[PDB]
Amino acid sequence: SVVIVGKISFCPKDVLGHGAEGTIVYRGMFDNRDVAVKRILPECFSFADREVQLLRESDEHPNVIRYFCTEKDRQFQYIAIELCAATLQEYVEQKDFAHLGLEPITLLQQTTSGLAHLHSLNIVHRDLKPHNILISMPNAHGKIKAMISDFGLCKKLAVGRHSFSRPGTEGWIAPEMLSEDCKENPTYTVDIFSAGCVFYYVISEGSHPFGKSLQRQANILLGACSLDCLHPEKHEDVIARELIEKMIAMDPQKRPSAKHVLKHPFFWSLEKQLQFFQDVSDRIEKESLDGPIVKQLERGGRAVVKMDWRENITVPLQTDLRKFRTYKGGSVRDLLRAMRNKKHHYRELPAEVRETLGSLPDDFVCYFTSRFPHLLAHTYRAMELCSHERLFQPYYFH
Amino acid sequence: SVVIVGKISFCPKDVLGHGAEGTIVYRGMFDNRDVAVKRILPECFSFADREVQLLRESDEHPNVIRYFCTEKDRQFQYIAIELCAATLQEYVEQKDFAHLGLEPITLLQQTTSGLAHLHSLNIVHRDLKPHNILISMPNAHGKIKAMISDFGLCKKLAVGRHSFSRPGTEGWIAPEMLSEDCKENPTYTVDIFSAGCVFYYVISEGSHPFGKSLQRQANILLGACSLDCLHPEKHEDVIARELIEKMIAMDPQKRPSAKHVLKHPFFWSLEKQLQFFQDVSDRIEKESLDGPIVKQLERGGRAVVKMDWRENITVPLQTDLRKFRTYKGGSVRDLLRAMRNKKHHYRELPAEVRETLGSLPDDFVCYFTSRFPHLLAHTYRAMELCSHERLFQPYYFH
Ligand SMILES: O=c1cc(-c2[nH]nc3ncc(-c4c(F)cccc4F)cc23)nc(N2CCC(O)CC2)[nH]1
Numbered sequence: 001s002v003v004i005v006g007k008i009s010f011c012p013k014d015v016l017g018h019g020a021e022g023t024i025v026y027r028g029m030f031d032n033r034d035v036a037v038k039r040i041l042p043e044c045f046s047f048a049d050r051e052v053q054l055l056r057e058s059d060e061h062p063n064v065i066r067y068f069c070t071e072k073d074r075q076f077q078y079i080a081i082e083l084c085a086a087t088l089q090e091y092v093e094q095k096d097f098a099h100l101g102l103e104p105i106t107l108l109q110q111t112t113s114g115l116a117h118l119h120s121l122n123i124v125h126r127d128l129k130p131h132n133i134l135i136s137m138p139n140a141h142g143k144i145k146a147m148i149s150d151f152g153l154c155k156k157l158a159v160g161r162h163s164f165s166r167p168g169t170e171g172w173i174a175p176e177m178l179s180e181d182c183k184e185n186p187t188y189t190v191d192i193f194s195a196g197c198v199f200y201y202v203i204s205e206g207s208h209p210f211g212k213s214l215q216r217q218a219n220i221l222l223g224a225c226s227l228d229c230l231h232p233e234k235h236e237d238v239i240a241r242e243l244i245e246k247m248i249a250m251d252p253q254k255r256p257s258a259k260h261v262l263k264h265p266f267f268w269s270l271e272k273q274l275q276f277f278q279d280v281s282d283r284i285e286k287e288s289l290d291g292p293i294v295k296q297l298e299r300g301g302r303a304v305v306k307m308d309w310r311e312n313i314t315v316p317l318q319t320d321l322r323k324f325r326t327y328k329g330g331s332v333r334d335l336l337r338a339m340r341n342k343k344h345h346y347r348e349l350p351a352e353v354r355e356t357l358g359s360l361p362d363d364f365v366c367y368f369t370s371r372f373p374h375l376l377a378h379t380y381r382a383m384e385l386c387s388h389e390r391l392f393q394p395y396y397f398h
Numbered sequence: 399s400v401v402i403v404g405k406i407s408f409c410p411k412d413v414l415g416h417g418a419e420g421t422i423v424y425r426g427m428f429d430n431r432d433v434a435v436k437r438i439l440p441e442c443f444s445f446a447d448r449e450v451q452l453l454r455e456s457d458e459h460p461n462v463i464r465y466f467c468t469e470k471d472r473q474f475q476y477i478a479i480e481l482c483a484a485t486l487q488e489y490v491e492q493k494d495f496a497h498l499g500l501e502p503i504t505l506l507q508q509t510t511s512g513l514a515h516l517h518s519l520n521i522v523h524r525d526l527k528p529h530n531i532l533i534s535m536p537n538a539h540g541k542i543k544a545m546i547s548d549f550g551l552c553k554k555l556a557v558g559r560h561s562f563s564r565p566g567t568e569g570w571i572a573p574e575m576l577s578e579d580c581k582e583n584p585t586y587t588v589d590i591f592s593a594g595c596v597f598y599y600v601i602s603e604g605s606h607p608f609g610k611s612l613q614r615q616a617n618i619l620l621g622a623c624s625l626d627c628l629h630p631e632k633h634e635d636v637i638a639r640e641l642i643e644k645m646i647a648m649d650p651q652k653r654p655s656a657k658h659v660l661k662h663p664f665f666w667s668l669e670k671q672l673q674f675f676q677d678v679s680d681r682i683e684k685e686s687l688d689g690p691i692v693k694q695l696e697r698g699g700r701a702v703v704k705m706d707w708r709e710n711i712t713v714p715l716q717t718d719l720r721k722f723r724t725y726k727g728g729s730v731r732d733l734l735r736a737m738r739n740k741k742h743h744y745r746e747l748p749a750e751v752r753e754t755l756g757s758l759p760d761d762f763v764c765y766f767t768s769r770f771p772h773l774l775a776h777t778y779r780a781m782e783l784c785s786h787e788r789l790f791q792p793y794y795f796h
């Protein structure tokens with residue numbers, strides 16, 4: 001048997017998966033396209049109408065699933081949406097990450113862009129989780145992308161409203177959604193909390209900041225989280241830790257907006273990381289040693305530099321830097337100056353110094369972030385003071 | 399009377415416009431959306447099938463019109479596509495540009511991105527013109543965008559094919575499409591030619607490089623073009639001239655690809671223009687005065703600098719530059735060094751010098767491009783020598 005309800009066609013044997021309250025998702029056809037066909041019981045008709053409306057408003061963004069058509073009969077309602085290759089859950093559960101490069105982080109970036117688009121339309125998702133972040137089928141050039149789906153529980157905030165009244169999948173629910181200690185009503189940042197748990201789930205390849213599945217939601221309410229898959233002496237893990245712990249903060253007002261998340265160093269290219277180092281080096285160049293900028297930059301600076309940073313770089317660099325200026329080994333500012341100096345004059349340096357540094361910009365900046373895993377995170381926090389100036393708008397969100 | 403053919407609905411009184419060979423475009427409805435409904439006579443059924451197929455392949459890009467559904471009856475075929483607010487023709491014919499800022503150039507950028515997407519799918523449009531570049535209706539944040547439409551005459555090149563055999567709207571047709579002197583078959587660059595004529599049509603607010611409409615196509619075949627709406631001593635017009643004359647070159651092999659067009663200074667922000675000046679200044683710093691780079695950079699450099707560039711800047715800058723280095727007034731390289739110098743030390747300079755320059759980066763770079771209208775175009779051409787190096791990949795297409 002093969003079902004045809006209006007312009008939507010599918011065969012009941014092609015079941016892709018199941019949702020809540022009797023929802024089934026089939027592989028099907030619409031307008032000679034392969035599509036996913038979502039079948040909703042009459043008890044959930046008000047959720048399908050909500051989903052259809054909110055998909056019409058937001059599916060123009062590439063990281064929101066495309067919506068095609070809807071139709072009803074006597075029995076059910078049918079929603080035709082973009083057919084996808086996998087969920088993020090099975091991507092994390094099945095794909096070998098060793099040879100995927102930055103693709104996992106790109107999926108998180110695309111998820112966040114789709115979330116930012118929803119929030120810019122005053123839509124809160126409220127049920128974000130790996131099960132409904134979808135991985136597209138490859139396009140004509142083999143590229144895949146993440147898409148947000150499943151809009152049955154979304155809330156459309158009225159014009160002039162920033163909060164909603166008080167719904168999700170246990171284990172991924174922001175605490176202010178379930179605790180009665182609700183000073184403020186929940187807002188867009190409930191999606192930031194869930195996203196933060198998703199971020200950790202992807203980069204840890206399967207763990208959750210609030211533990212194993214049976215205890216997860218109870219740990220969220222207690223604030224008991226652990227990010228120990230992130231090693232504290234690895235640059236990439238330090239950066240990810242800094243972002244994720246803000247995304248999952250118990251206080252919703254301390255969580256960054258989606259657009260704020262998108263500006264974080266977690267997503268910067270290596271080229272952009274080096275440009276941030278150069279730009280901060282120039283900003284603090286003629287700065288006062290007693291000023292608030294260099295004060296913030298040097299507070300806790302001893303551990304960032306490893307007591308004396310000149311003792312923690314390769315000898316060919318160490319012999320080269322003694323000649324011209326001779327820098328201060330306990331200053332983070334002086335570490336940044338040496339980096340800036342060696343990048344600007346990179347092609348004047350002898351072949352021995354260009355060898356241990358590597359090429360500009362990627363290898364060069366990794367020479368430093370590998371050996372000073374806290375440098376970028378520390379510098380990024382200190383220079384929040386300059387987040388409003390023009391030079392630093394590529395790096396901070398206003 | 400109100401027509402309903404399948405899931406497409408429209409009323410024959412809501413005519414938006416007409417196309418070739420009896421095609422009519424109506425305002426209509428599909429799935430409770432407002433849509434454009436394209437009605438095609440049986441004589442053009444093979445073109446509607448071509449359009450439906452190629453829209454299915456390419457409408458995912460934001461600057462290709464979105465396709466919704468198609469249906470037939472006894473009489474006609476109907477295509478439901480995104481409803482748009484205007485054509486580029488009426489935009490140019492009716493909108494006051496004085497208060498639109500960079501919006502016209504952004505429309506050209508978006509058109510080119512849609513074209514690049516088609517070409518990346520081995521689709522040549524072959525009938526690009528202001529009449530079928532559409533202006534979207536504003537989104538929820540008031541923003542508009544350009545979209546390519548009308549795919550009835552598109553060619554899908556077979557896998558492994560780069561040319562097609564030998565169709566358009568008179569006045570916008572690349573010469574190799576009509577002249578029998580066809581050494582090479584037409585390729586994607588027929589769309590570049592048309593686009594180049596569209597570029598000039600927008601920035602001149604209604605003119606065409608090959609003249610008035612009755613003589614246009616005859617001038618194309620003769621190679622007789624004129625871009626004299628572009629003043630030769632205005633930076634923005636110099637840059638646009640440089641691009642447009644390559645886009646409309648008679649020799650198709652001299653026209654840049656769509657992705658090449660997208661990298662041209664015509665589309666650079668002011669910030670990016672200044673960064674190009676700084677990056678070239680650093681690249682030629684320790685360069686040999688006899689080398690090929692500085693040779694190319696100085697060839698024809700006297701007119702770029704206006705005999706002596708130190709005599710063509712404001713006196714407060716002139717008094718400031720004499721102090722430290724004292725530069726050479728006939729060298730383009732030295733002009734670039736002074737610029738680079740004053741940007742790097744911008745906050746060390748006295749208030750008089752920061753005043754006549756303006757703020758970084760926008761006013762600062764305009765101080766120089768306003769007074770040396772050929773500087774950027776000249777520097778961009780000379781430094782094509784370095785187009786392959788890593789530092790200059792933001793500026794040239796490989
Ligand atoms: O709103 C929606 C939209 C979609 C959806 N829309 N296009 C899709 N293409 C493929 C799949 C899919 C699958 F079903 C199982 C394994 C791999 C797959 F790729 C799902 C798709 N699916 C759900 N559900 C609820 C949450 C469940 O975890 C999954 C099904 N809800």
Ligand SMILES: O=c1cc(-c2[nH]nc3ncc(-c4c(F)cccc4F)cc23)nc(N2CCC(O)CC2)[nH]1
Binds near residue numbers: 482549
């Ligand atoms: O393939 C296509 C798709 C569309 C099309 N698709 N959505 C549209 N929304 C609005 C308009 C539109 C109009 F019709 C007249 C004035 C202002 C407008 F905005 C046209 C639209 N139109 C044509 N034609 C052929 C070339 C003609 O110059 C125009 C009509 N061809």
